[PDB]
Amino acid sequence: MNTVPFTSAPIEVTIGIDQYSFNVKENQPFHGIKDIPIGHVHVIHFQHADNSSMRYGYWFDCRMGNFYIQYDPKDGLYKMMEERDGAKFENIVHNFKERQMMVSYPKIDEDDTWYNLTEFVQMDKIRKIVRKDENQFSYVDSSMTTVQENELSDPAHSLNYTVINFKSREAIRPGHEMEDFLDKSYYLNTVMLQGIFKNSSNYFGELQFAFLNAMFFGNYGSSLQWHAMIELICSSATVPKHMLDKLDEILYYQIKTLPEQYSDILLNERVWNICLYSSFQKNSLHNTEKIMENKYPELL
Amino acid sequence: GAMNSSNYAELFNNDIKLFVDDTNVYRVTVHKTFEGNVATKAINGCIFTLNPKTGHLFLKIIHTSVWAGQKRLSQLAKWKTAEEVSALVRSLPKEEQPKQIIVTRKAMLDPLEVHMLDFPNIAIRPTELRLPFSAAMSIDKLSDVVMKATEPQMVLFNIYDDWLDRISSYTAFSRLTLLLRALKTNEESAKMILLSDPTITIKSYHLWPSFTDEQWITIESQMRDLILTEYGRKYNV
Numbered sequence A: 001m002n003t004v005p006f007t008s009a010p011i012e013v014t015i016g017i018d019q020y021s022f023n024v025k026e027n028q029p030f031h032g033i034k035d036i037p038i039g040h041v042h043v044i045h046f047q048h049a050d051n052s053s054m055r056y057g058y059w060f061d062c063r064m065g066n067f068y069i070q071y072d073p074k075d076g077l078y079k080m081m082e083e084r085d086g087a088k089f090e091n092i093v094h095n096f097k098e099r100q101m102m103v104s105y106p107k108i109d110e111d112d113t114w115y116n117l118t119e120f121v122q123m124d125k126i127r128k129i130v131r132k133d134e135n136q137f138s139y140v141d142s143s144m145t146t147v148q149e150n151e152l153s154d155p156a157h158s159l160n161y162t163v164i165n166f167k168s169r170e171a172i173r174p175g176h177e178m179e180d181f182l183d184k185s186y187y188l189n190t191v192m193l194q195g196i197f198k199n200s201s202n203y204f205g206e207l208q209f210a211f212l213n214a215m216f217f218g219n220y221g222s223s224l225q226w227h228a229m230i231e232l233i234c235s236s237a238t239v240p241k242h243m244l245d246k247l248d249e250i251l252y253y254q255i256k257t258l259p260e261q262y263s264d265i266l267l268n269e270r271v272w273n274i275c276l277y278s279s280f281q282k283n284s285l286h287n288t289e290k291i292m293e294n295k296y297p298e299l300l
Numbered sequence B: 001g002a003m004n005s006s007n008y009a010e011l012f013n014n015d016i017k018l019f020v021d022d023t024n025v026y027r028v029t030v031h032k033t034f035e036g037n038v039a040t041k042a043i044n045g046c047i048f049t050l051n052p053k054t055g056h057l058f059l060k061i062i063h064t065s066v067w068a069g070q071k072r073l074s075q076l077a078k079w080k081t082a083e084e085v086s087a088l089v090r091s092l093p094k095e096e097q098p099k100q101i102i103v104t105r106k107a108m109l110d111p112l113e114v115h116m117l118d119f120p121n122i123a124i125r126p127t128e129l130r131l132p133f134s135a136a137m138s139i140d141k142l143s144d145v146v147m148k149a150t151e152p153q154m155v156l157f158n159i160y161d162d163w164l165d166r167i168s169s170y171t172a173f174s175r176l177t178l179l180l181r182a183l184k185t186n187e188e189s190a191k192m193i194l195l196s197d198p199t200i201t202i203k204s205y206h207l208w209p210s211f212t213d214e215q216w217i218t219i220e221s222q223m224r225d226l227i228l229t230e231y232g233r234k235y236n237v
């Protein structure tokens, strides 16, 4: 079990750790989060009490280093940093734990909600989508645009998701125009899976990372990416059977976790109705269709 | 974006553009089978591709053999249209290729966009105008070449005959759309108007009769009357 200590909490802020959130008051004696499960990526995120604008946060994996949070009063935000002095870090954490100045990552011992949302998400791949190679953790916020959004403006601060565009020469083989537009299997299987992602695990990892960015920071571009990756599968007549079964599980847990009150804006009516009721895979997502119909029947 | 009444004179500027109408590509007769079920029999069709500034009509005849063994023909027809328009563009010298292609039906937008991905600078546009190009097969010489075709064939016409020697392309297009609107609303009446007088003939190399300027004014008035009529006969006004 790993720990992310905080130097202090000088400004009132709502802090989230994965799917959990808690409030910290201005100058409250808060010194971080302990008992963080090893084996998963994690995200620690922030919304200031005085400017709910800009949710921001950091993706990290405690196996990759000792990380802490420190507020910067010049840049006005809580920053993640790496402590290279391992003995200094262990000493700091032990003192904060002895003084019980940390919230404990919940230890609910029955379901894998976070595992189920991050099954295919790897820190190495996050770091290729979010480029800042001198850090082992990755910063994301509400406003960051994607490389595709920038083609339609600061490249260093962009989300480099894989570009998916159904009306692109990459997606459409000369002479197979109708075939490739109406059945995207070529684009899914040859271009994207064999060619770019190499395997379905990496495809699902980016899909899951895009959803989490769309939900935790209200990142419009991440939302677009998540839906495009769903639609590319649902619009392919030929999809490996294990991929469909896994996609159904992935989406089920995503829909289950979504805040009920953010559904109106986080769920694209057109894509979901097409995917569940018109697409080649309309009958292949039983778990997802059942939770969607019972939880958001308005959208459909 | 979309073409409508406000941006109408754009049709007659000097940017090359083509209208594409797909309404006569896939044509059928519906009939009863011996068992009393219903079946269709395809007949030859055509793509109607028109330069509104010059009158140049690229009539691609769609022979019924292109449907043999194919499913979902109404969907296929839109993609075949887009394939043939793309092929026409590629066949033209660069300086004759259109800068815009305006489709008369919005269901042609995605098929044509996809077939024209190689031409990112050609704009594919819909229109809000209700244009009467479906009535092209009421022009006798066009219907004749379509029904006589035994294989795929492109035939070139000037749909304005020699009118541009005397009138502007705005006026010529307005005359064409009035004639076609009339033929679409009451083909028999419209054709009676156009041919009642046997001394006005259609030149061998023309589609419409050789009316004088004065006779066109009379003809044009008779077509307006017809359209207004039928609009009463229809709605009882």
Ligand SMILES: C[C@@]1(c2ccccc2)NC(=O)NC1=O
Pocket: A020, A021, A022, A023, A103, A104, A105, A106
């Ligand atoms: C246990 C915790 C929480 C648990 C479940 C949902 C939301 C928050 N409470 C708290 O102060 N911090 C947390 O993580």
Ligand SMILES: C[C@@]1(c2ccccc2)NC(=O)NC1=O
Pocket: A214, A218, A219, A220, A221, A223, A265, A266
């Ligand atoms: C509504 C919103 C959105 C954000 C993330 C996913 C879907 C919608 N659109 C936008 O411009 N900012 C948002 O929060």
